[PDB]
Amino acid sequence: TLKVSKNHINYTMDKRGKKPEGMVIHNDAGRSSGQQYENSLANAGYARYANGIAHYYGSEGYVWEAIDAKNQIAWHTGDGTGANSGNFRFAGIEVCQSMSASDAQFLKNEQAVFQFTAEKFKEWGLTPNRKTVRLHMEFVPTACPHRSMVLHTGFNPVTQGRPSQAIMNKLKDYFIKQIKNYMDK
Ligand SMILES: [Zn+2]
Ligand SMILES: [Zn+2]
Ligand SMILES: [Zn+2]
Ligand SMILES: [Zn+2]
């Protein structure tokens, strides 16, 4: 059972003018659960937000909704705010504790994120595929999502550099299958 906490950040993000095109699934590269991010970031100063803030933060049993992606953008892919940026077009969710959690716990954090994404896709009328389910590294060259990639592909972008398209697709296809599973029930 998944708790969703609607507790919006202390700042107002620009309107998009349309529903999200899909979901970018990030890893937080961090050490906090969804609740811990909420506790520290829901009511915070702009100095914290200016360093980046995604729409959603998920871990086992819990998703914090920082920004309603339905009509508002977020700062998650680092490619500016133009109409072709991931920030403008895509909702962003972080799988939390991607450094601190054990493999078993992190994999459960991922499943909470897939189930939530599935719920969003139903609301926004989207079908999961390589166009609607995305990686941060497709927008700017980074090693995110580092933990998901190493567990699901065996390739570690932290130590091995940029992965090939086939490695990226192996990971996206895994995300897509699971989101599809939850949408089907
Ligand atoms: Zn629309
Ligand atoms: Zn990312
Ligand atoms: Zn610690
Ligand atoms: Zn451990």
Numbering used by the authors: 189 to 373
Question: What is the paper's account of this structure, in its own sentences?
Answer:
The staphylococcal phage lysin LysGH15 demonstrates great potential against methicillin-resistant Staphylococcus aureus (MRSA). Lysin (also known as endolysin) is a cell wall hydrolase that is synthesized at the end of the phage lytic life cycle and is involved in cell lysis and the release of progeny particles from host cells. LysGH15 shares very high sequence identity with other lysins of class III staphylococcal phages, such as LysK, phi11, and MV-L. Moreover, these lysins possess a modular structure containing an N-terminal CHAP domain (cysteine, histidine-dependent amidohydrolases/peptidases), a central amidase-2 domain (N-acetylmuramoyl-L-alanine amidase), and a C-terminal SH3b domain (the SH3 bacterial binding domain, which typically contains 60–70 residues and is homologous to eukaryotic SH3 proteins). To elucidate the molecular mechanism, we determined the structures of three individual LysGH15 domains using X-ray crystallography or nuclear magnetic resonance (NMR).
The structure of the amidase-2 domain (residues 165–403) was determined at 2.27 Å resolution. PSI-BLAST analysis using the National Center for Biotechnology Information (NCBI) database reveals that the amidase-2 domain contains a conserved zinc-binding site. Structure-based mutagenesis also confirms that E282 and the zinc ion play an important role in maintaining the lytic activity of the amidase-2 domain. Although the sequences of the LysGH15 amidase-2 domain and AmiD are divergent, they exhibit homologous structures and share conserved active site residues. In AmiD, E104 (E282 in the LysGH15 amidase-2) and a zinc ion activate the water that is bound to the zinc ion, which favors the nucleophilic attack of the amide bond; the tetrahedral intermediate is stabilized by K159 (this site is occupied by T330 in the LysGH15 amidase-2 domain). Mutational analysis demonstrates that E282 and T330 are critical for the activity of the LysGH15 amidase-2 domain. Thus, the amidase-2 domain of LysGH15 most likely possesses a similar catalytic mechanism as AmiD. Here, we find that the amidase-2 domain of LysGH15 from phage (virus) also contains this conserved residue (i.e., N275) at a corresponding position as other amidase members. Nevertheless, the LysGH15 amidase-2 domain is not entirely silent but additionally exhibits the ability to enhance the lytic activity of the CHAP domain. Therefore, the amidase-2 domain may cleave specialized substrates of the peptidoglycan, such as the bond between N-acetylmuramoyl-L-alanine.
